[PDB]
Design a binder for this molecule. Sequence first.
Ligand SMILES: Nc1ccn([C@@H]2O[C@H](COP(=O)(O)OP(=O)(O)OP(=O)(O)O)[C@@H](O)[C@H]2O)c(=O)n1
Ligand SMILES: Nc1ccn([C@@H]2O[C@H](COP(=O)(O)OP(=O)(O)OP(=O)(O)O)[C@@H](O)[C@H]2O)c(=O)n1
Ligand SMILES: [Mg+2]
Ligand SMILES: [Mg+2]
Lengths: 226, 227
Amino acid sequence: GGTILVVTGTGTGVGKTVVCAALASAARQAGIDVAVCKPVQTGTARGDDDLAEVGRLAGVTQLAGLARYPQPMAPAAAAEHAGMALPARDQIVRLIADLDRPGRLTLVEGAGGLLVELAEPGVTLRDVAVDVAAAALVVVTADLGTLNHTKLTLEALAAQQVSCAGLVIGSWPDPPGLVAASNRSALARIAMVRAALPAGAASLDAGDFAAMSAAAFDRNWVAGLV
Amino acid sequence: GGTILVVTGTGTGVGKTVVCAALASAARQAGIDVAVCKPVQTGTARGDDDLAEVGRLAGVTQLAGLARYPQPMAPAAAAEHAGMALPARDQIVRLIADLDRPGRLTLVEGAGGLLVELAEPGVTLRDVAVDVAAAALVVVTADLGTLNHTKLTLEALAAQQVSCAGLVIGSWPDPPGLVAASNRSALARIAMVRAALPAGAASLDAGDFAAMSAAAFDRNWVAGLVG
Ligand SMILES: Nc1ccn([C@@H]2O[C@H](COP(=O)(O)OP(=O)(O)OP(=O)(O)O)[C@@H](O)[C@H]2O)c(=O)n1
Ligand SMILES: Nc1ccn([C@@H]2O[C@H](COP(=O)(O)OP(=O)(O)OP(=O)(O)O)[C@@H](O)[C@H]2O)c(=O)n1
Ligand SMILES: [Mg+2]
Ligand SMILES: [Mg+2]
């Protein structure tokens, strides 16, 4: 095996996908081989496609998915609306374990938060992470409430002995403001803040994104991942 | 003693205060004596006063605060910015215990979500609930993400053996979209949904808010809250 990291977030819209892409670009610039798996994608009618974003921004080519639901709903709702089950637990876990190899950082992106349902019957990104011995990278906001949400997620992580690889602030505002600055310090009082990605990085081109990403993570940590 | 509920939520801004007021109103109209307690209150320099708002909507007269910070921040941060300290765990529990009385329903509204720090070091409303043996009423949204946040909150409640008294959807839109409807029906499978307060309820005057309040909750559940 190699390094499997699940990339979760305190909620929906915290920039999990942009963090996957950023870590991917950093690791690739460290000469690490990266794969990204997004088992279930919703919102496809309006063009939601987070693996494509990772491809565009980071140049990852090993981009693995199992199901696509048109509706911009939570996976289980989208499944119900479309009239089709979610994938099974086994499909996700073996797709990920077949992606994993020596030398590779394999990022696994869930949908929404940690406890959202990802497969039949009621299995979550947390379960998947258990099944594959992955650590968890927690993407957070810098807004009022982030502390509560972070501690809640880290507590759920620990309840199943999924190790915490750290937090990333998905979007660092400009200019910051009092709340975001104080929250950044507190977040660092509960876990290793690995990076804070400038607000708007998503819209960068691949070159500028690569420069941002390179400077956003500690190089030794990135290298030390695999 | 009497009955104590901490009234918590999946985050900040979900309708905790309005639920305190609504449940207090329904319980008052059931003849139950009601106290509402707000041990940590931030954002006073912006005119935030949750106790006053409960009194304004519900007529609750037994309102107890303790710590008040000017800035609209996390209590830890608002205290650090005022040059002040957080209360002690026993200060908060004392404030609550002095309110407790047979036949009285004592609602304890927190600062933000369940794991926000109320006292040094890292003391939360969950700890306070264990200390005063209270049950937790969890206010939720109907919006995307509410299932994850709700499950996280319930799981954190069971982590310390704190009973869940049920959920209350703080703001229920009329009409409900596809996501709201789905989230509601899933929430009913995760826990007892005690009420779904209609959106904009803070705009109802005393009588409108009391009517809405009595209809919002099952009369039998409210009455069963207090012997
Ligand atoms: N530093 C950042 C981080 C995020 N985004 C934007 O923030 C929004 C949501 O972030 P996303 O990367 O989509 O993360 P997710 O948490 O995966 O969203 P969800 O799980 O709900 O699909 C996107 O428009 C993304 O383009 C941005 O512009 N600059
Ligand atoms: N059924 C509802 C629910 C909420 N609100 C409004 O939406 C906001 C949130 O209500 P509040 O109880 O203040 O949410 P809390 O979680 O209590 O806010 P805080 O985190 O600051 O304590 C308020 O402006 C309130 O007037 C409303 O009008 N009717
Ligand atoms: Mg995403
Ligand atoms: Mg409030």
